[PDB]
């Protein structure tokens, strides 16, 4: 599923992320944007051998059991595929034990680099929420 940008704002409210350790609502939005396009079946590979997957990118070497990134954990205890369902629980379940790890958002690239220290509210405004 390619989520709308205030539809997704809503789906991730519903599930807790507004204000989760201190991140508002639009770094979440900000981070799926640029992490994925809003697409939930997105996945890209990484020089490692591992590869992430999902609306917010989440990577086998750690965080989920794809069957193919030896040596890897699976602290999320999940089967990466979950990762990519029109349904966001599960990757949002997975996010809040990433961003709780002791990182916060910097676990994530692209948020670091495009949402870190810019307007993130832009990303929820005209949103009814």
């Given at each position: 599923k390619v989520f709308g940008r205030c539809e997704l704002a809503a789906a991730m409210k519903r599930h807790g992320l507004?204000?989760?350790?201190?991140?508002?609502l639009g770094n979440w939005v900000c981070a799926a944007k640029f992490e994925s396009?809003?697409?939930?079946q997105a996945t890209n590979r990484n020089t490692d051998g591992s590869t992430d997957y999902g609306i917010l990118q989440?990577?086998?070497?750690?965080?989920?059991?794809?069957?193919?990134?030896?040596?890897?954990?699976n602290l999320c205890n999940?089967?990466?595929?979950?990762?990519?369902?029109?349904?966001?629980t599960a990757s949002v379940n997975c996010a809040k034990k990433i961003v709780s790890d002791g990182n916060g958002m910097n676990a994530w690239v692209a948020w670091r680099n495009?949402?870190?220290?810019?307007?993130?509210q832009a990303w929820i405004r005209g949103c009814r929420l």
């Open positions: 507004d204000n989760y350790r201190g991140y508002s396009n809003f697409n939930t989440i990577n086998s070497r750690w965080w989920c059991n794809d069957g193919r990134t030896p040596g890897s954990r999940i089967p990466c595929s979950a990762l990519l369902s029109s349904d966001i495009r949402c870190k220290g810019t307007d993130v």
